[PDB]
Ligand code: HEM
């Protein structure tokens with residue numbers, strides 16, 4: 027017709043009654059059966075266009091990539107973000123900062139030391155810290171959160187920290203606080219009613235204070251770098267950004283500034299820590315529930331890699347089962363069910379519907395990741411979803427946990443390295459033991475807002 031169809035919204039409240047609050051993804055799936063793959067929803071007064079199923083997602087994100095390359099900024103994000111980096115940036119500001127970040131985040135994008143070497147050092151440090159637990163019951167939340175944060179610390183400041191260093195503990199405290207705030211179920215009420223942000227500013231003020239603390243901490247590092255930076259010899263992301271700024275002195279306007287560097291660094295810490303941490307925490311929980319899966323991974327680790335050397339990225343192609351398990355964890359868990367909000371760059375005609383410039387687009391990653399035809403029994407954890415009859419790795423165009431198109435995760439290659447290297451290192455050195463027993467523990471995702479998190483669990487890391 028003209029505009030995508032949808033349920034008639036109620037005045038002021040919008041479509042909140044149909045969407046709900048607990049499971050947003052199931053509501054979008056039910057609405058798609060009534061309104062089709064392209065439908066309109068109202069988050070208060072804000073019109074949102076939801077894309078359900080692979081065909082609609084692939085046509086928008088890949089075929090009309092540039093048109094759907096914009097980032098939709100919700101009321102809370104708008105108030106909690108003073109200055110943009112990469113995540114909430116748009117236009118030429120986003121295009122330049124993203125292109126720089128992608129080139130810098132390549133394996134050999136920051137001088138002599140590789141991204142892999144930084145992850146490999148962290149994987150070795152992770153094992154040493156799990157060894158300190160003395161095979162006693164523990165909540166892995168803290169230890170599994172330390173490694174991805176330290177990888178970004180090693181990428182931004184060229185040096186990792188001891189899991190006891192106060193400045194590292196402070197940085198993690200601000201990141202965990204911000205995630206707890208963003209993952210609080212009553213937060214979407216601010217997006218449905220942007221007026222409530224003015225009457226109840228306590229939420230966004232706390233996010234602003236933690237971001238300002240992180241920005242100022244990063245500012246100390248950029249000054250230390252400016253003091254000892256050697257041009258022609260970069261060691262990290264800051265060094266690469268400062269020399270890009272030197273190349274930008276001619277044609278002064280510049281998208282690359284000390285301010286934009288602080289914003290990009292906090293974005294990389296925010297988007298790169300909890301995503302990887304939660305996936306690792308969920309992976310270990312799923313490995314406890316399925317010890318037969320864990321045993322087959324350990325068989326591959328013992329045969330391809332030994333016990334006398336650390337795992338590397340070259341081992342992955344020779345390890346189809348382990349690669350399938352990693353892919354299955356990401357596919358099953360559906361970490362970001364609706365990804366990050368998108369926005370249309372210009373007025374476009376999509377599926378015989380007119381979507382005007384700046385309209386917020388919600389990509390249902392669940393509809394792709396949990397496709398019934400591509401993954402028979404999609405609500406069940408099964409490495410066979412990424413395996414053929416012979417046990418060889420079976421790729422899927424439906425594997426979109428990092429989303430797709432122009433806005434695809436900048437840390438896709440990094441997260442892949444971290445997930446593979448950390449999990450193989452843990453299972454090479456330790457056997458996972460549950461105090462509750464495999465039958466008793468629940469692995470069903472706890473969807474509270476716009477992120478899937480595992481339930482609380484404890485486990486023993488027994489050395490092999
Ligand atoms: C398993 C771990 C991870 C998952 C599942 C994940 C997932 C995602 C998803 C779904 C998006 C939204 C893409 C979109 O807008 O459609 C995203 C964006 C982003 N992620 Fe990741 N991510 C992960 C790890 C990381 C890491 C380690 C980094 C650090 C380099 C990172 C940096 C980013 C950035 C900077 C963006 C914004 C991209 C942009 O607006 O252009 N992510 N990620």
Ligand SMILES: C[C@@](O)(C(=O)Nc1ccc(S(=O)(=O)c2cccc(Br)c2)cc1Cl)C(F)(F)F
Pocket residue numbers: 103106107113204205208209233237292293296297298300301304362476477
């Ligand atoms: C700096 C800030 O932009 C921020 O931290 N934002 C942010 C961080 C992580 C994600 S995430 O999608 O990686 C995510 C979100 C919740 C739970 C998990 Br697990 C992962 C999304 C955002 Cl907008 C802030 F908002 F604080 F200002």
